[PDB]
Amino acid sequence: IVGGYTCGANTVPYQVSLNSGYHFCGGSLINSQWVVSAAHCYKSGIQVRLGEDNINVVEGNEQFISASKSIVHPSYNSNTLNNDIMLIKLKSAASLNSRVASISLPTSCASAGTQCLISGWGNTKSSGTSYPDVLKCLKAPILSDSSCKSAYPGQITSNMFCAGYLEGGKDSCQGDSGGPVVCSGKLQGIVSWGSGCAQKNKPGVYTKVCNYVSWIKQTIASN
Ligand SMILES: [Ca+2]
């Protein structure tokens, strides 16, 4: 996250870190045994780390649970990043409490102008690289689909939305992928892509979670 703020320990209780020896992507806990992330974060050997603040220090609220299965969206296209969503099942259910909690799926799609919370452990610089260790947060509005398409001609599908600031300076970034965009207490987006980070006229692009609620529910019900 570039241009954000330190969230505070366990203030984003649905945020998870996906670990394969190291943090590589975010995700969102949506029930005691399932995480939503980006399909472009897929790999084998995932350990889901819940209750994290500093990802390099054991601070006392962590739960580390290996994944038993991953399910990339059936129509994910890695070239266009259309349908950039995947589900990860935990081998055992997480213990839910104030500091480790699921986030609700949306009942309806958000609108442009709504403020959301974006979070992650990704790069905090637009130029160069610095990874923060504690969780970072950014409040940002969803942008109009016309603004989004104008920023990224020929690239924005109905399964994507832009959020952030056209002026630059505030955005998600490398290492935030797969993490949450939460608006009015519901998971509306997944950190997906963008051209660089926090550049002028290049806002963040996010997977539009409300389009996937039926798929998510059905998939969980049979897996
Ligand atoms: Ca920790």
Side-chain angles (χ1 to χ4, degrees):
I1 304 287
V2 178
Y5 61 99
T6 297
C7 303
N10 308 298
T11 62
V12 187
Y14 52 83
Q15 171 84 56
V16 309
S17 169
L18 305 183
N19 186 106
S20 61
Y22 49 86
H23 167 84
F24 67 88
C25 274
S28 300
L29 189 67
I30 59 164
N31 69 24
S32 67
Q33 212 164 354
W34 289 89
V35 166
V36 168
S37 187
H40 85 257
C41 292
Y42 165 78
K43 59 167 74 185
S44 64
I46 297 177
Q47 187 186 62
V48 176
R49 298 190 164 204
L50 306 102
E52 287 283 19
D53 190 44
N54 190 316
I55 50 168
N56 277 318
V57 180
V58 177
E59 296 180 298
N61 292 292
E62 296 90 349
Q63 297 175 49
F64 296 169
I65 305 171
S66 296
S68 57
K69 63 185 70 170
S70 290
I71 304 169
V72 164
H73 192 276
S75 297
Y76 172 59
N77 181 316
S78 58
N79 292 327
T80 62
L81 299 181
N82 196 29
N83 307 294
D84 192 11
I85 187 171
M86 70 178 297
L87 285 162
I88 300 165
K89 193 178 185 180
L90 301 183
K91 278 180 86 75
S92 57
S95 182
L96 305 182
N97 49 253
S98 59
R99 293 183 175 79
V100 178
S102 56
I103 188 74
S104 293
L105 296 175
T107 293
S108 67
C109 298
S111 295
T114 294
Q115 185 195 78
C116 306
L117 183 69
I118 309 176
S119 51
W121 290 275
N123 189 4
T124 61
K125 296 184 169 288
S126 182
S127 298
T129 301
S130 183
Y131 274 71
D133 300 324
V134 300
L135 188 67
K136 296 289 181 183
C137 275
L138 176 65
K139 290 182 180 185
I142 297 179
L143 299 177
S144 67
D145 285 337
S146 61
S147 289
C148 190
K149 289 175 166 174
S150 292
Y152 294 106
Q155 302 155 253
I156 304 301
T157 73
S158 64
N159 300 308
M160 298 172 192
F161 67 88
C162 291
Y165 298 90
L166 296 178
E167 59 262 48
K170 292 180 159 185
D171 197 4
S172 57
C173 200
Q174 309 112 36
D176 293 321
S177 289
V181 181
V182 165
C183 321
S184 302
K186 306 304 164 72
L187 184 67
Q188 294 284 182
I190 303 165
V191 180
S192 182
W193 63 276
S195 177
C197 308
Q199 302 299 299
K200 184 178 176 190
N201 292 143
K202 291 299 177 176
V205 190
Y206 299 92
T207 309
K208 190 170 174 164
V209 173
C210 64
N211 293 357
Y212 297 99
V213 173
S214 178
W215 173 76
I216 292 167
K217 290 180 171 188
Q218 289 173 195
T219 298
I220 288 176
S222 290
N223 288 275

